[PDB]
Amino acid sequence: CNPSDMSHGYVTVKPRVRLHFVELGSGPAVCLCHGFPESWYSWRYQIPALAQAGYRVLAMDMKGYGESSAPPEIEEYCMEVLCKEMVTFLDKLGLSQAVFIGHDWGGMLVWYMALFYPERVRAVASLNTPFIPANPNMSPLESIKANPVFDYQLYFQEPGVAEAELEQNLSRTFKSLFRASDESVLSMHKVCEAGGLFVNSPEEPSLSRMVTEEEIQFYVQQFKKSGFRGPLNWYRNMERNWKWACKSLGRKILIPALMVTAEKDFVLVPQMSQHMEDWIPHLKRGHIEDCGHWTQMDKPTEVNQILIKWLDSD
Amino acid sequence: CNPSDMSHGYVTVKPRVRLHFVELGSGPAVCLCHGFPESWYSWRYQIPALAQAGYRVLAMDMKGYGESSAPPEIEEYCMEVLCKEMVTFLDKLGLSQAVFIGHDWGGMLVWYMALFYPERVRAVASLNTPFIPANPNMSPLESIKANPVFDYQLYFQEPGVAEAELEQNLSRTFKSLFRASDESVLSMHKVCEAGGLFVNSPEEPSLSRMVTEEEIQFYVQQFKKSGFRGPLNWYRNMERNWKWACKSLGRKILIPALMVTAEKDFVLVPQMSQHMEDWIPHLKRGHIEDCGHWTQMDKPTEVNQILIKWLDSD
Numbered sequence: 001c002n003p004s005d006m007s008h009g010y011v012t013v014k015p016r017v018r019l020h021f022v023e024l025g026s027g028p029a030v031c032l033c034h035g036f037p038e039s040w041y042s043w044r045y046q047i048p049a050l051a052q053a054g055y056r057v058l059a060m061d062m063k064g065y066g067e068s069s070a071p072p073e074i075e076e077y078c079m080e081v082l083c084k085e086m087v088t089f090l091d092k093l094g095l096s097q098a099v100f101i102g103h104d105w106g107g108m109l110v111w112y113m114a115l116f117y118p119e120r121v122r123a124v125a126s127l128n129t130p131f132i133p134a135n136p137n138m139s140p141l142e143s144i145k146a147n148p149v150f151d152y153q154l155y156f157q158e159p160g161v162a163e164a165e166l167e168q169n170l171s172r173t174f175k176s177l178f179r180a181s182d183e184s185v186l187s188m189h190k191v192c193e194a195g196g197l198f199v200n201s202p203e204e205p206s207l208s209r210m211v212t213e214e215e216i217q218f219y220v221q222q223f224k225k226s227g228f229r230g231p232l233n234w235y236r237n238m239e240r241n242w243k244w245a246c247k248s249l250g251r252k253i254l255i256p257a258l259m260v261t262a263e264k265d266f267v268l269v270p271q272m273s274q275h276m277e278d279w280i281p282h283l284k285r286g287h288i289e290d291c292g293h294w295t296q297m298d299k300p301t302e303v304n305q306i307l308i309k310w311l312d313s314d
Numbered sequence: 315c316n317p318s319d320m321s322h323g324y325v326t327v328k329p330r331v332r333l334h335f336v337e338l339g340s341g342p343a344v345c346l347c348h349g350f351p352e353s354w355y356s357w358r359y360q361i362p363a364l365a366q367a368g369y370r371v372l373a374m375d376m377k378g379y380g381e382s383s384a385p386p387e388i389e390e391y392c393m394e395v396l397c398k399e400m401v402t403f404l405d406k407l408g409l410s411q412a413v414f415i416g417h418d419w420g421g422m423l424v425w426y427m428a429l430f431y432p433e434r435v436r437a438v439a440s441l442n443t444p445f446i447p448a449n450p451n452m453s454p455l456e457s458i459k460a461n462p463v464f465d466y467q468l469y470f471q472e473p474g475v476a477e478a479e480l481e482q483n484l485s486r487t488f489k490s491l492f493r494a495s496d497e498s499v500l501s502m503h504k505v506c507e508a509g510g511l512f513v514n515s516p517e518e519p520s521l522s523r524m525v526t527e528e529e530i531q532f533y534v535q536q537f538k539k540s541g542f543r544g545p546l547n548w549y550r551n552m553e554r555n556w557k558w559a560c561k562s563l564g565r566k567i568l569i570p571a572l573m574v575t576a577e578k579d580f581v582l583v584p585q586m587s588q589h590m591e592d593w594i595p596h597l598k599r600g601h602i603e604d605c606g607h608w609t610q611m612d613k614p615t616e617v618n619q620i621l622i623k624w625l626d627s628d
């Protein structure tokens with residue numbers, strides 16, 4: 001993939017908030033939303049394949065990332081605000097509807113789009129990230145306590161702290177993160193006790209079989225623009241997000257929906273998706289074997305075939 | 315029309331050259347190509363209307379204009395090089411085809427797209443600009459010295475001369491040009507001998523019925539960035555354009571085609587188009603009464619009606 005071979009698009013959704021996207025293809029509009037800590041570029045294997053399949057692909061830099069605005073305020077990254085901004089995004093593009101496909105934090109964003117703005121969502125697909133309805137009798141902080149695999153999320157809370165570590169050496173950050181599940185070097189269990197996220201793992205990590213040095217260097221140049229404050233702010237709105245998700249009053253998602261799970265993602269575990277058809281009647285499923293968290297890079301061919309088949313029928 | 319309420323796209327068609335466009339709507343892609351000395355903004359009335367009619371509108375800043383690159387070299391603005399760039403533009407957006415609609419210089423560009431790249435052009439429409447096959451005997455220089463109202467074209471030839479007059483007071487330039495035919499304050503007859511283009515015209519011209527002061531100021535701000543050199547270079551490739559056109563002399567436009575004529579355009583007179591069915595037998599037509607050169611600005615409601623009706627049928 002080569003950025004300078006792409007169309008680059010810009011939409012101002014709020015006086016000083018500008019979302020950047022890459023665009024390829026003609027046909028119905030498909031909006032791709034990456035997660036943490038990623039980029040439009042994370043969709044590099046899907047963009048040409050979806051375009052070739054007869055779709056108009058808009059791959060976003062999410063708020064806080066790449067060439068999009070990265071305001072420093074925490075409240076700018078609560079889910080309600082990010083969702084309304086995606087609505088304004090469609091209005092300025094003149095799109096009445098789009099298909100939304102997301103991954104990770106982007107997966108969370110697309111479910112809420114479908115929950116609260118189903119008239120603007122043609123169909124919705126998520127990689128890894130399940131839709132779990134708000135629990136009115138359990139805060140998000142009490143969910144993190146029960147499951148110690150979400151310990152890193154507490155380390156992400158204090159502004160500045162996680163930034164300094166992820167920003168210290170960008171190349172190292174991305175080489176340590178972007179790895180197949182069997183190549184993992186990360187201690188996710190004890191992050192607060194250790195003091196750092198990488199503080200037990202190599203100083204000069206090897207290149208994962210998933211990525212080339214060129215691809216890693218692309219992420220390095222992108223994160224030099226605004227760093228990690230914007231992206232990490234996505235984790236600092238738990239109570240606000242909880243209170244907003246309660247306003248749905250147990251309504252259902254009635255549009256065509258796809259949940260694709262990945263066998264080896266140890267944070268967004270497949271079983272976490274098990275009760276979804278209760279809240280989502282018209283839900284179809286995909287499942288990818290031998291696939292870790294970084295689905296699009298890990299199993300691009302499988303992702304492509306699943307998304308294109310679902311798109312052509314639903 | 316508020317620019318900040320639009321989606322802005324950028325495509326690098328070559329190292330030194332990026333093209334800017336504005337994008338609205340979904341459906342088949344319609345590319346709009348303005349003339350001299352205009353802007354994507356000259357399409358302000360057609361953009362929302364075509365999008366609402368169910369089309370995906372791409373409104374270009376042509377090479378040398380607004381946010382597009384404006385290289386100083388004269389050879390960068392010959393029709394051959396401009397057309398190849400339009401094709402590269404379609405390639406990088408991943409569009410196999412587009413409907414092309416042009417006015418003025420943009421009119422002549424879209425005809426040539428239809429001739430040399432029929433496979434990339436779904437349908438072709440021109441406002442004001444007729445399709446006249448290349449005359450292999452007389453040069454374009456010979457046609458000018460045979461037609462008195464084309465005198466300003468020789469005045470445009472010497473690099474720096476028309477530039478300095480046009481860029482002197484930008485506000486005056488646009489208020490003098492952008493007028494109805496009955497409000498006209500310019501003589502195209504004797505420009506070369508009698509100083510320049512504005513020598514005989516008011517210093518503080520009134521605002522035309524077609525434009526607001528706010529609309530004039532948008533053009534002013536746009537032309538402050540590159541001035542008139544790029545735009546005028548369009549007029550400085552006559553021998554090359556004639557040479558290139560001759561290579562097409564035998565072939566025929568077989569795609570759907572629309573020619574729209576403005577009764578009161580005193581440079582692009584309707585009768586100039588009278589023999590077009592002799593090369594395009596299936597040519598559909600439109601005609602707009604009491605309408606000058608600045609067609610989109612002058613009779614936008616008629617322009618919209620004519621374009622949408624043709625788009626929905628062929």
Ligand SMILES: CC(C)c1noc(C2CCN(C(=O)N[C@H]3C[C@@H]3c3ccccc3)CC2)n1
Binds near residue numbers: 036105130152267268
């Ligand atoms: C449904 C709930 C459990 C849920 N789903 O997604 C989430 C969000 C929070 C948890 N999620 C999250 O942190 N994603 C992690 C892979 C990325 C990461 C973690 C540590 C270090 C580097 C990168 C994914 C997004 N919560």
Ligand SMILES: CC(C)c1noc(C2CCN(C(=O)N[C@H]3C[C@@H]3c3ccccc3)CC2)n1
Binds near residue numbers: 350581
């Ligand atoms: C086939 C021939 C007749 C032909 N068709 O288009 C042309 C081009 C050259 C002539 N054309 C041209 O100059 N357009 C004039 C409106 C612009 C203008 C004139 C004076 C001062 C300011 C602006 C229109 C485009 N030639």
